[PDB]
DNA sequence: ATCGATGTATATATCTGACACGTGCCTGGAGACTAGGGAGTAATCCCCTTGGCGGTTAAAACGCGGGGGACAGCGCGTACGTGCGTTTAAGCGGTGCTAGAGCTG
DNA sequence: AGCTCTAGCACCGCTTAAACGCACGTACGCGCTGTCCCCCGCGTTTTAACCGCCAAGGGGATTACTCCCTAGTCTCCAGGCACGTGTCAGATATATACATCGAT
């Protein structure tokens, strides 16, 4: 019959088959369930969608249509929750926030 | 060719600029010395892991893969070089 | 030789969330590392949850617990829903 | 004797405190950092080579360490009712993390 | 199995108990504002640990929060605990 | 004429007394009630093993004594001897918990 | 022939076979070499022997013939290298090292 | 049923290093947990070292590199020394 | 309070090399297939957690006094910062070299 | 074991802005001195933790059964990746408008 990719059956933009092969070849367990690569591809797609959503918002705030890892750093760090996930993460060519302490301002 | 010392190569206005990227107003005179010290011990810790990673693979150069992997083991993942 | 990555997939995801945004090659590398690291975290705790319960399979329950584990907060309330709908699609497609 | 126009000590510091936090360029010069990386990897063995991306990643990670440590150092300094940093602030920021 | 809907148990960690917990750490004097910030950070830490512990229980389809689940939950946050099997 | 010691002496005496002892500084039953209160809104009608409760005892006590040692260092750095909530926040936020 | 344990073949007292079985069942790799269990058992013996030696010395300093977990904390926290190893590790029934800051000491 | 533990082995280690000193049960479980934790750490680092070099077999060199990464300072040198003499004794006695 | 230079930002055009797009090509995802044992379920025993009771008593809570210790204020003074001028080595480019990655067998 | 060939390394020149040292000034560190209120130690008082005993029975654990599910093998083809081409958006440059900071 005509072959259909499992990501399209799942309605996903991330590969079910590649994730399933990596779960097999990562040797995490002896067996891998059917819906587990679908579910993991879906959570990867959701995280990618949120992080690129914040990246696009930061880029539009910067008025720069192609996103830079600076825009990525503003995307990850300004989010109150996503910063906790990427807390022990250094983004290459990322930089820091333009924060000035209230005492350090001139009188 | 063996280098004698370039701890002084880490420039004092360069430490001033890194601290200003950190968000400070004024810098003490000793900061240029203990900042070089902590940078030296951190680079010692990272480079030791990097070179032993390279020695594990029968390789005699140090790739960015092994630097990123040593940083990942150290507790600070680095995104941008694989 | 050929090298395997996630560049076209994150490009498709960015295109479907934003039709008029570009993205640099350094950001290709960062998304590749980020997807690989999140996959490594989730699959690692899936293996740990399998080994804690004397479990020989990794089903959707282990991955669901891992997603509730790594991610706190409202994404913990989001990513366990979205992926659930994914398998809700899959059981309606198989 | 007349004097040229000049700023207060601290306000051009704030002008570049805003200027240096909006950019993402590397702060340490590339050659001295590469030479330092080469000299640290000497007691391990000689005749070791580094790719340019390896030195790039090392410099970016070390600059990230120094910027995070300097935010913590400035925060320890502002805790002690001071606006400038001190060495004992550096050992405080190292000691709280449990890496001293 | 809960006998009653418990509430306001944060005062169970008393001011003298906070005083001993500070004394083991090696501090001489305690201000009056310590005794609620300490209770707040204690509440935050226990919420963070018990959330992971109860997810470990519900993955096992159990009703009892065993010691092994608490050990693994503390191992997940980077604070490994010994003496409870491991 | 009572034997009132100087305030700032018996505090150090009991510092030395507690630092050699492994007894549990938090009573078992208030921590039972607190653990049940925290675990109540995560699932109703949960049960706890006694060894799990002891694990909560030891992990909580170690975390609190480490936090108080860090805030003691932060306080003595700030030319003071009495810890304050700003010391708590400073030690936590340098540690990265905030 | 006569069965003879691999632990005595290696001059080793932690078991070779148990470490080999937990290496195979631990899903670390698809294959495990012959020298891997004996090397890992030797490393485990060195660490256990070092901590037990320091705990015995600490118990002689306290004058009991028993290692209480307080002695284990005193053993693993007084040695700087073992402190660096077991830094993020909590040992039950251990307490803290009896240290007082010199600012707090009056004279 | 029976639960596996490293109790008697670290007990005879104690009898070898301190022949006139016993052990308590709580400290016995603490040492068992320490053995399991270090075993998991070194085996996980060896698994990473094998996977990162496209290697499928964990050899003695894998764990030698893993213990060179994990154990800091002079314990690394004594660990690799005792591991090397153990494996040479194993090969010579075989 | 007001006005001025110095500084950052705003706007428009030219220019360029990275990224968007397309094409050829092939490893690996997909469909079909059988088999085996892990997995889900039920039946079962029973350790063990919850619950209640009672008395013991260690300890929490309470108020008291008083004096360090916190902290505002002040002055002084060294050490910063800002600036100009000079010096210097990074930065950039090309050239030339081969060690040593990297793939196949 | 061995061939191929990327790229790390060595170097050399010049243009370059930072790097460097120094000169002048002032805000800021540190210490003193002030008030004082804040907490510690106390006995008295009071609550509940604690022991332990008993008991109800849920719930984890074991044993047993049977079946859906996934590794495994085989065949096949299209999505995916390397490769190539060419716009086009961002960097660069110059002119213009607005605003923070200085000091009239």
Numbering used by the authors:
A (entry chain g), G (entry chain c): 12 to 118
B (entry chain b): 20 to 101
C (entry chain h), H (entry chain d): 29 to 122
D (entry chain a): 35 to 134
E (entry chain f): 17 to 102
F (entry chain e): 37 to 134
Please quote the authors directly.
In the yeast Saccharomyces cerevisiae, PIC assembly occurs adjacent to the +1 nucleosome that is located downstream of the core promoter. The general transcription factor TFIIH engages with the incoming downstream nucleosome and its translocase subunit Ssl2 (XPB in human TFIIH) drives the rotation of the +1 nucleosome leading to partial detachment of nucleosomal DNA and intimate interactions between TFIIH and the nucleosome.
Complex B was resolved at an overall resolution of 4.0 Å, with local resolutions of 3.4 Å for Pol II, 3.6 Å for the nucleosome and 3.9 Å for TFIIH. The observed roughly 75° rotation would thus correspond to a DNA translocation of 2 bp toward the active center of Pol II, and this is reflected by an observed bending of the DNA duplex into the cleft of Pol II around the initially melted region. The transition from complex A to complex B also led to a further detachment of nucleosomal DNA from the histone octamer. This Ssl2 wedge stabilizes the two detached turns of nucleosomal DNA.
